[PDB]
Structure 1
Amino acid sequence: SSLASTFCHGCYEEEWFTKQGGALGIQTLLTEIDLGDLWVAAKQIEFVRALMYVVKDMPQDLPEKTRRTAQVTLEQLLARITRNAKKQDCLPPPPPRLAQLVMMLNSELAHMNRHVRATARRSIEAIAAAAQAEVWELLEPHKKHILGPIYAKPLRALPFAIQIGYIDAVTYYMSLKRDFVPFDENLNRLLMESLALADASDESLAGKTLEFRTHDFIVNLRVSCIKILSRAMSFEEFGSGSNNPTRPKVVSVFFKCLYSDSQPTIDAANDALKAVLQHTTKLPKDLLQSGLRPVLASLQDAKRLTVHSLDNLGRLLRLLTTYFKVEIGTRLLEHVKQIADPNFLQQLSFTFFEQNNAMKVIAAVFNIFHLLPDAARQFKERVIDNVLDLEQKLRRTHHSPFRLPLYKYLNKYPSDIWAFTLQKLEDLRYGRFLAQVLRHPDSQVLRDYGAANVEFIIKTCNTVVVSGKET
């Protein structure tokens, strides 16, 4: 008992190596001595508390070995103490072995540290699996201990980390079963607060002084709000009885978040919009027009063309497939023609122009042609000639910033590309270009088509040879 106490107290010291020693000592006592089952049953609560404290108290900018050690030891302990578990042992009496442990683990689901929440949910799932039960069955009695404190205070006044933890806890709770969290007034007020937070600007959120960590906090808060609103959108009771523009507002906020500069926000909004589009199967005209207006606004002038706007167009094309129209590619080609100046191109040579902004804009323009609808098969000659002329002006062979998007677009219509190339077998440029394309590691579709139609290739070549010309 004294040795166990020493190991458990080692976990609470402020030196990290002492914490690691404590966790390792607990592991050694668990998996190398076999002091018996009653002993572990009497030490389990202290062991769990000490390991969870080690997870809580480690600074997050040091190496992660100590936290991993604590988590592994916790996994082993939980595996040991649930050897012959049963549903009667985990739930409170109508004393149960694991009810106190379940309550203690539930109490840490809203912590301000994300690793703590991850560990707690992992442990709860591990316990539930061993008892052939559902998580909601175990967590129903202790739901108030989490829900009550969160609904007490206004969410706007709290620091960032506390808000993130609270929102994550509610989001996890409202996924266990369809009626776990009722749609009462408290939940509606919380959801409206989340919508307001997601729709706000960085300056309004305590100001963005360009500091790294404030920006990180704001991004994380936005991601959490987006996720909770997306989960709420899956319920038919949300926004229905209101009959007000709640769901349209959520969709507008999603679209606004899709056009942001932060990648995590873009990914979260992309997932939310994908789910909404899959579920709805239909879209009101006005809402989609409002969502599309900003994208079409920025594609009208070649002087203000940017990589960001073209990325937004690409994301929108990926989301709404059968909604766009042809004749935007022609406008993009005209913009490319305008941007590429013979004197500018002459000057650009002699330099490593991979870092030029105009070249990046042109590459972004070319990157859109493999996302356009199927009818974009009529631009193959135009784009191939454009790229070849651009490379000729820059005195480049085998390599340029424009090869990757062109290859991506060409690998989608192998039949058309092969027919076009075989129609021009008496020119060295086109054969050389197709051979160069085939040698890229990612041109497997074209390689398969060519391996299938070697017969037609040889037939056309033999026809040309038998014709008896100088070419």
Structure 2
Amino acid sequence: QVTLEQLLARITRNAKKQDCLPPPPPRLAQLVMMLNSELAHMNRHVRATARRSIEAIAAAAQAEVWELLEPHKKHILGPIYAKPLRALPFAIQIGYIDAVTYYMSLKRDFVPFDENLNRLLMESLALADASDESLAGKTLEFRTHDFIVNLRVSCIKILSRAMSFEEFGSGSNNPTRPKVVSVFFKCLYSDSQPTIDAANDALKAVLQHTTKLPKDLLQSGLRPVLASLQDAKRLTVHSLDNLGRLLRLLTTYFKVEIGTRLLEHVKQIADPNFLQQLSFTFFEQNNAMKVIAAVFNIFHLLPDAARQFKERVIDNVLDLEQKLRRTHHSPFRLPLYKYLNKYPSDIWAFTLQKLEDLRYGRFLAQVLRHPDSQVLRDYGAANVEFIIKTCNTVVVSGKET
């Protein structure tokens, strides 16, 4: 790759737009054709190298990539439209979808919305909507799983790019866009990180672009997550992760009392005998503790109305630590710090309101010493005067504490 970069840099020293295009001979026309021929390869490094080289050639000649690639678009588009996408092996499908996605990004009208493109997009939607067992069967094998994940990511990316075009699905009025959004939501709740990230990016982009959401579609999207949050025994880390993702996506949509229900679940799970037995061992790898930590992790994502649960959460964490005989360290400290770092004024006021007690100043001092508690330190630096004033009032009040 480095040798190719050096050669390309050397041979385009005095390039001009005329030399990089076919005559109405040109030096770089054959080179550009050859590089463009490699954009649909089955190897991702080859595709990346080809597109890097094409961009480098275009920049030197002071031209646009679409200008250079317009004459040769057929050489890539014809073969892709000539076969049914559902019969090819995984790698060929991935390469074809990536090539089409890149081609339809150079300019708005580069790839017309003819019958072939619509058929390809419907095939991509069907593929993304399929199941692991359906796609040749998931034997738990590493390579088949990786191929399936990559194919799903490519399908999601192409559908997300098609969403940006106001032509796609507008002239049909059939459930195409709703189906795309439903597929995005279904992918957002998968067990694979790459597909999760792709779906999250696509969903946030579409939410920003639309600026509004039909009530029925969002109700359908949000039903599955709230379905599983109605039983303490059935609570799992994956459901809480999905809830956190949705809270991060749709900020001003959710409602209060979900935190109270979660706290009720936490109280139910924390059995006294269970905790007494869980002591005497390294309980950081237990499932119940992980579920409790996941529940506590959500409170820093809820809207501003969650500010009223600070005392409840602090008391819960302190009581849990007391039951387990731990200090300075427990699985619940990190999410609690994340939550407390969002309301410095409130936490400082609450702490200073209870200066006489030794159980709260110690906790706040422990919180401040963590590397990530910077906003709290800034607020304390600002209001050191208030802190000293209240301490002086307490000391002058004339008590034994």
Q: TM-score, normalised by structure 2?
A: 1.00
Counterpart CA distance in 2 for 1:173 and 1:246 is: 22
Q: Report SS of the residue matched to 1:197.
A: helix
Counterpart CA distance in 2 for 1:248 and 1:228 is: 16
Per-residue deviation, 1:468 = 0.6
Deviation digits for residues 438-457 of structure 1 (CA, Å, limit 9, x no counterpart): 00000000000000000000
Q: Does 1:88 align with 2:23?
A: no
Counterpart CA distance in 2 for 1:177 and 1:241 is: 21
Per-residue deviation, 1:235 = 0.2
Q: Does 1:440 align with 2:381?
A: no
Per-residue deviation, 1:95 = 0.3
Per-residue deviation, 1:197 = 0.0
Counterpart CA distance in 2 for 1:188 and 1:230 is: 14
Counterpart CA distance in 1 for 2:149 and 2:393 is: 63
Counterpart CA distance in 2 for 1:287 and 1:420 is: 42
Q: Report SS of the residue matched to 1:177.
A: coil
Per-residue deviation, 1:202 = 0.5
Q: CA RMSD in A?
A: 0.2
Per-residue deviation, 1:437 = 0.1
Per-residue deviation, 1:285 = 0.3
Deviation digits for residues 343-396 of structure 1 (CA, Å, limit 9, x no counterpart): 000000000000000000000000000000011110000000000000000000
Counterpart CA distance in 1 for 2:307 and 2:54 is: 54
Counterpart CA distance in 2 for 1:405 and 1:179 is: 48
Per-residue deviation, 1:193 = 0.1
Counterpart CA distance in 2 for 1:123 and 1:246 is: 37
Deviation digits for residues 206-234 of structure 1 (CA, Å, limit 9, x no counterpart): 00000000000000000000000000000
Counterpart CA distance in 2 for 1:274 and 1:110 is: 28
Deviation digits for residues 143-185 of structure 1 (CA, Å, limit 9, x no counterpart): 0000000000000000000000000000000000000000000
Deviation digits for residues 241-270 of structure 1 (CA, Å, limit 9, x no counterpart): 101000000000000000000000000000
Larger radius of gyration: 1
Equivalent residue pairs, number: 401
Per-residue deviation, 1:412 = 0.1
Deviation digits for residues 95-122 of structure 1 (CA, Å, limit 9, x no counterpart): 0000000000000000000000000000
User: Aligned runs of 1:215-226 on 2, under 5 Å?
Assistant: 215-226=145-156
Counterpart CA distance in 2 for 1:249 and 1:82 is: 47
Deviation digits for residues 72-103 of structure 1 (CA, Å, limit 9, x no counterpart): 00000000000000000000001000000000
Counterpart CA distance in 2 for 1:236 and 1:294 is: 29
Counterpart CA distance in 1 for 2:28 and 2:182 is: 46
Counterpart CA distance in 2 for 1:440 and 1:285 is: 43
Kindly, what percent of the aligned residue pairs are identical?
100
Counterpart CA distance in 1 for 2:165 and 2:183 is: 18
Please name the residue that 2:271 is paired with. 341
Counterpart CA distance in 1 for 2:79 and 2:266 is: 58
Q: Report SS of the residue matched to 2:156.
A: helix
Residue number among 333, 355, 358 corresponding to 1:403 in the alignment: 333
Counterpart CA distance in 1 for 2:319 and 2:304 is: 26
Deviation digits for residues 13-51 of structure 1 (CA, Å, limit 9, x no counterpart): xxxxxxxxxxxxxxxxxxxxxxxxxxxxxxxxxxxxxxx
User: What stretches of structure 2 of length at least 5 have no aligned partner?
Assistant: none
Q: Report SS of the residue matched to 2:18.
A: helix
Please name the residue that 1:30 is paired with. none
User: Aligned runs of 1:61-72 on 2, under 5 Å?
Assistant: 71-72=1-2
User: What stretches of structure 1 of length at least 5 have no aligned partner?
Assistant: 1-70
Per-residue deviation, 1:334 = 0.1
Counterpart CA distance in 2 for 1:206 and 1:380 is: 51
Counterpart CA distance in 1 for 2:214 and 2:12 is: 53
Q: Does 1:362 align with 2:362?
A: no
Counterpart CA distance in 1 for 2:118 and 2:2 is: 39
Counterpart CA distance in 2 for 1:342 and 1:142 is: 72
Per-residue deviation, 1:415 = 0.1
Q: Report SS of the residue matched to 1:462.
A: helix
Counterpart CA distance in 2 for 1:254 and 1:288 is: 12
Deviation digits for residues 284-312 of structure 1 (CA, Å, limit 9, x no counterpart): 00000000000000000000000000000
Q: Does 1:102 align with 2:39?
A: no
Counterpart CA distance in 1 for 2:380 and 2:24 is: 72
Counterpart CA distance in 2 for 1:401 and 1:176 is: 48
Per-residue deviation, 1:134 = 0.2
Please name the residue that 2:88 is paired with. 158
Counterpart CA distance in 1 for 2:228 and 2:338 is: 25
Counterpart CA distance in 1 for 2:215 and 2:327 is: 48
Q: Report SS of the residue matched to 2:108.
A: coil
Per-residue deviation, 1:281 = 0.3
Deviation digits for residues 407-450 of structure 1 (CA, Å, limit 9, x no counterpart): 00000000000000000000001000000000000000000000
Counterpart CA distance in 1 for 2:22 and 2:124 is: 35
Counterpart CA distance in 2 for 1:187 and 1:81 is: 37
Counterpart CA distance in 2 for 1:414 and 1:426 is: 20
Q: Report SS of the residue matched to 1:367.
A: helix
Residue number among 265, 269, 291 corresponding to 2:221 in the alignment: 291
Per-residue deviation, 1:333 = 0.1
Counterpart CA distance in 1 for 2:133 and 2:348 is: 54
Counterpart CA distance in 2 for 1:256 and 1:243 is: 22
Counterpart CA distance in 2 for 1:318 and 1:341 is: 31
User: Aligned runs of 1:57-206 on 2, under 5 Å?
Assistant: 71-206=1-136
Superposed structure 1 runs of 4+ greater than 6 Å apart: none
Counterpart CA distance in 1 for 2:358 and 2:103 is: 65
